[PDB]
Design an enzyme around this catalytic site. Structure first.
Site, PDB file in Angstrom:
ATOM      1  N   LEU A   1       0.927  -1.207  -0.079  1.00  0.00           N
ATOM      2  CA  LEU A   1      -0.127   0.052   0.083  1.00  0.00           C
ATOM      3  C   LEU A   1       0.824   1.153   0.058  1.00  0.00           C
ATOM      4  CD1 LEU A   1      -2.630  -1.098   2.531  1.00  0.00           C
ATOM      5  CD2 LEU A   1      -3.279  -0.668   0.236  1.00  0.00           C
TER       6      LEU A   1
ATOM      7  N   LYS B   1       2.096  -2.991   8.958  1.00  0.00           N
ATOM      8  CA  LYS B   1       3.114  -2.500   8.842  1.00  0.00           C
ATOM      9  C   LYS B   1       4.447  -3.162   9.448  1.00  0.00           C
ATOM     10  CE  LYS B   1       4.913   2.092  10.675  1.00  0.00           C
ATOM     11  NZ  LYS B   1       4.933   3.067  11.579  1.00  0.00           N
TER      12      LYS B   1
ATOM     13  N   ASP C   1       0.539  15.507  15.543  1.00  0.00           N
ATOM     14  CA  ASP C   1       0.747  15.813  14.104  1.00  0.00           C
ATOM     15  C   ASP C   1      -0.516  15.540  13.520  1.00  0.00           C
ATOM     16  OD1 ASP C   1       2.626  13.286  11.962  1.00  0.00           O
ATOM     17  OD2 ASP C   1       1.940  15.569  11.498  1.00  0.00           O
TER      18      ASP C   1
ATOM     19  N   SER D   1       5.446   2.215   0.778  1.00  0.00           N
ATOM     20  CA  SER D   1       6.624   1.938   1.218  1.00  0.00           C
ATOM     21  C   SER D   1       7.467   3.166   1.323  1.00  0.00           C
ATOM     22  CB  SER D   1       7.360   0.728   0.303  1.00  0.00           C
ATOM     23  OG  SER D   1       8.497   0.228   1.029  1.00  0.00           O
ATOM     24  N   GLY D   2       8.053   3.660   2.543  1.00  0.00           N
ATOM     25  CA  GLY D   2       8.970   4.849   2.578  1.00  0.00           C
ATOM     26  C   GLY D   2       9.786   4.610   3.350  1.00  0.00           C
TER      27      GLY D   2
ATOM     28  N   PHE E   1      10.089   4.520   7.029  1.00  0.00           N
ATOM     29  CA  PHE E   1       9.658   3.711   8.094  1.00  0.00           C
ATOM     30  C   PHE E   1       9.946   2.096   7.578  1.00  0.00           C
ATOM     31  CE2 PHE E   1       5.876   4.923   5.474  1.00  0.00           C
ATOM     32  CZ  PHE E   1       5.429   3.686   5.256  1.00  0.00           C
ATOM     33  N   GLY E   2       9.618   1.928   6.303  1.00  0.00           N
ATOM     34  CA  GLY E   2       9.762   0.465   6.023  1.00  0.00           C
ATOM     35  C   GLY E   2       8.376   0.085   4.814  1.00  0.00           C
ATOM     36  N   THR E   3       7.492  -0.510   5.276  1.00  0.00           N
ATOM     37  CA  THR E   3       6.640  -1.002   4.182  1.00  0.00           C
ATOM     38  C   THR E   3       5.170  -1.173   4.909  1.00  0.00           C
ATOM     39  OG1 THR E   3       5.864  -2.513   2.576  1.00  0.00           O
ATOM     40  CG2 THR E   3       7.619  -3.197   3.677  1.00  0.00           C
TER      41      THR E   3
END
Ligand SMILES: Cc1nc2cnc(Nc3ccnc(N4CCC(S(C)(=O)=O)CC4)n3)cc2n1C(C)C
Length: 302
Positions: free
Chosen positions: A22, A49, A139, A24-25, A27-29
């Site tokens: 969905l 996550k 945030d 992936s950045g 942070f991980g995926t």
């Protein structure tokens, strides 16, 4: 204070299946998945996550799991459970329509005054729950508001909750690093502005360092074309220097609810009434076997 009696559910890797990616950045995926418990004859659409394995990163994801498992509200994203694999992963509820920011951008030609005002109530409702639980978000943005169904939204991303996005931050948050429930009210104001502009970027072109002086001078985000002075007055009230002068989330629930009863009197959208978004009324609104599938909001163990 009060002991946090929240239940942390440990889930087996074998109990769930990863379908597609969905997002992936850094942070991980994040994966779209299905959770089939032991022998409960149910399939729960999930969002998994997962994070290499470094002891510093593992500590951060477990703190996010702590906050996510502590909350429970119809307008707040909850943690379903965690899987203790070599990497470690959070099992969350699938929000098929993604974030509200991408949704308002991609569906602007079909988003009417009723939906916009109902989302405002829903966000204020989740934020008022977080207030009652003594939790400060830190945030809040249209990017951190997920869409379950076009008529049901929930607040997420507790990576900085606590019991930098300058363009969403309050004055005390930038100059003195003061984060209160009233500083989240400023962030709510920017969130509403994002919605009313159909996903437009706040203070576009302007750098993050100049923001501090701009706010002290008295400059705020402009009045969206669809906004009446009634709706804009509320956004402006969220951006007062004095935090106590800003509205409370319970007042925001009331204010937008009044407006949600006669939406065309508070938001002027050309094409309103002839607009429509997906709903359970639609034929095939809901890949493999879709017989035995139930949402996480209806799956509860005693
Ligand atoms: C494109 C997309 N489709 C989704 C469907 N379902 C969820 N489900 C949930 C449920 C609860 N929380 C979350 N968020 C938690 C924080 C993450 S992250 C990986 O950025 O920490 C983003 C999503 N997602 C998230 C989804 N996304 C995000 C990547 C924005």
């Amino acid at each position: 204070e009060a002991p946090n009696q929240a239940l942390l559910r440990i889930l087996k890797e074998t109990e769930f299946k990863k379908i597609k990616v969905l997002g992936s950045g850094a942070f991980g995926t994040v994966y779209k998945g299905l959770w089939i418990p032991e022998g409960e004859k149910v399939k729960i659409p999930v969002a998994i996550k997962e994070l290499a394995t470094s002891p510093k990163a593992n500590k951060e994801i477990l703190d996010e799991a702590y906050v996510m498992a502590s909350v429970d509200n119809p307008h707040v994203c909850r943690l379903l459970g965690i899987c203790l694999t070599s990497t470690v992963q959070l099992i969350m509820q699938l929000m098929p329509f993604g974030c509200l920011l991408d949704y308002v951008r991609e569906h602007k030609d079909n988003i009417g005054s009723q939906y916009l005002l109902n989302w405002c109530v829903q966000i204020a409702k989740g934020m008022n729950y977080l207030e009652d639980r003594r939790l400060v978000h830190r945030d809040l943005a249209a990017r951190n508001v997920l869409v379950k169904t076009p008529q049901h939204v929930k607040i997420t991303d507790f990576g900085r909750a606590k019991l930098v996005p300058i363009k969403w931050m309050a004055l005390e948050s930038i100059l003195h690093r003061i984060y209160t429930h009233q500083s989240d009210v400023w962030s709510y104001g920017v969130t509403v502005w994002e919605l009313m502009t159909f996903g437009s970027k706040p203070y576009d072109g302007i750098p993050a360092s100049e923001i501090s002086s701009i706010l002290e001078k008295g400059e705020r985000l402009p009045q969206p074309p669809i906004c009446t002075i009634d709706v804009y007055m509320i956004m402006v009230k969220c951006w007062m220097i004095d935090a106590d002068s800003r509205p409370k989330f319970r007042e925001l629930i009331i204010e937008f609810s009044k407006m949600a009863r006669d939406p065309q009197r508070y938001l002027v959208i050309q094409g309103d009434e002839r607009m429509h978004l997906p709903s359970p009324t639609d034929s095939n609104f809901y890949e493999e076997d879709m017989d035995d599938v139930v949402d996480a909001d209806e799956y509860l163990i005693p």
